[PDB]
Design a binder for this molecule. Structure first.
Ligand code: 18V
Ligand code: 18V
Ligand code: UDP
Ligand code: UDP
Lengths: 234, 232
């Protein structure tokens, strides 16, 4: 609650997070966005951006070799970009809100978790990652800890179509069944609420859930109405 | 007020033996063993993780070097914190002796592995980026007051690996020891090597010749440490 509110936008690949955050950011000078490091890698530029494309391209080619390296770097860059904007942006605001394109928790409990369950990380890779994940996200008092979560809910089919509409040459190859396992794990943690995390407060952190199957680029008012209503109870 | 002194040197050159001798000499003197050495042997998940990843590292360094280097250093950083925030309370003249450092992690072993092609440019540039920042947020109060360099030849070292009897190590060739030997000379003797940590340019170094056996004859090495600490 102090002082900038921190909300994560969560949803499957191409569910629409980046459209929706670009939408939200224009609606209030009190609202700003921290976009996904991985989402920018997918496109001279900087060191991380250089590294990102490489590990991203290698992740696509042989994920059982690169998942640990990709995951730990994706998480670091996220922690870096969020911490930066936390003090950086929104210095003068009555009601400041930082929207995150995904969280350190999706990094682990959706993406890293699935890669493990899918045999792209062996047990020692998953234990090392989790250990590294703990120690560090436990070094941050209550600073990146979220006040809420906006789950952008979709079908894997909507997500499959919106990948080809997006037209990322490497992403075209992502299968429907992959989207499904990620989808199932999103529903699990956010909607059904099965998944237990190693972070205590998460079971109590408010969750707003939004079906986004219908194109919203021209018709977002009801969505944004649900954003504003949710933010006034936190 | 706690003084931080890193003890550096090649494998088997005698570092653990040294700090073990030193810790017994003063209530005010404490020690942080290097985690890789802890794994180089019930216990914890770190031991389990480090046990497994060291074995992997021995079988296929080209696959496991990045992961291993990330984990060796995170485990060290943490180990050094728990000493600094829970040991030497609240002595008159505290000195904590780290067995190696995050600098020897990066500028000796990780660099050496990249030169020997066990990491590619991506891995090494990811590691350094990781290293420049993991130290920044979490590892600031770990800044070194001084460094002690235990200097022994690669042959001395091969003999000592033989003496120590770790069978996992009994296949480490002379050649490898010879590599790590150069890395230390350029950093700690010739003082050539440049780093991104600028305080590490000033840092006082003391060099000690440990080619002769010292388990029953260390009094003159300890005098130089005591002298070196007073200059600080
Ligand atoms: C969508 C771009 C990033 C990629 S690429 C990828 C992938 C690519 C090829 C694959 O098989 C050939 C693959 O299968 C993994 C094994 F099932 C995953 N998964 C992913 C998702 S893992 C991930 N972790 C994060 N922490 C963040 C994030 N955005 N994505
Ligand atoms: C003492 C056991 C740790 C090992 S194992 C190892 C190694 C073993 C077998 C190898 O070839 C098959 C090998 O080859 C490297 C490429 F020539 C390295 N190097 C090392 C040194 S890497 C290291 N990094 C650290 N950061 C710390 C530390 N103590 N050691
Ligand atoms: O209502 C929508 C939402 C998204 N998109 C498109 O779907 C693709 C994927 O959306 P986005 O990149 O925002 O998904 P993310 O991966 O960020 O969740 C993009 O080309 C969007 O332009 C669309 O046509 N209509
Ligand atoms: O002066 C010495 C130094 C070392 N050693 C032996 O060399 C082996 C390796 O030394 P240590 O474990 O201290 O080396 P490190 O790897 O820590 O530098 C040990 O079994 C010691 O008993 C010795 O006998 N005399």
């Amino acid at each position: 609650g102090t002082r900038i509110k921190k909300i994560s936008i969560e949803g499957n690949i191409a569910a629409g997070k980046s459209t929706f955050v670009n939408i939200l950011k224009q609606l209030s000078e009190d609202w700003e966005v921290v976009p996904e490091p991985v989402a920018r890698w997918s496109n001279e530029l900087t060191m991380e951006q250089k590294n990102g494309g490489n590990v991203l391209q290698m992740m696509y080619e042989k994920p059982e070799r690169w998942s640990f390296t990709f995951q730990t770097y994706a998480c670091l860059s996220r922690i870096r970009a969020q911490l930066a904007s936390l003090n950086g942006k929104l210095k003068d605001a009555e009601k400041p809100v930082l929207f995150f394109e995904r969280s350190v928790y999706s990094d682990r409990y959706i993406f890293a978790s699935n890669l493990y369950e899918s045999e792209s990380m062996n047990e020692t890779e998953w234990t090392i990652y989790q250990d590294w994940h703990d120690w560090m996200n436990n070094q941050f008092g209550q600073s990146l800890e979220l006040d809420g979560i906006i789950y952008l809910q979709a079908t894997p089919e909507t997500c499959l179509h919106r990948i080809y509409l997006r037209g990322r040459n490497e992403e075209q190859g992502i299968p429907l069944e992959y989207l499904e396992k990620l989808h199932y794990k999103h529903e699990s943690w956010l909607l059904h609420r099965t998944l237990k995390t190693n972070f205590d407060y998460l079971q109590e952190v408010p969750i707003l859930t939004l079906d986004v199957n219908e194109d919203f680029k021209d018709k977002y008012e009801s969505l944004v109405e649900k954003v504003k209503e949710f933010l006034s109870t936190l």
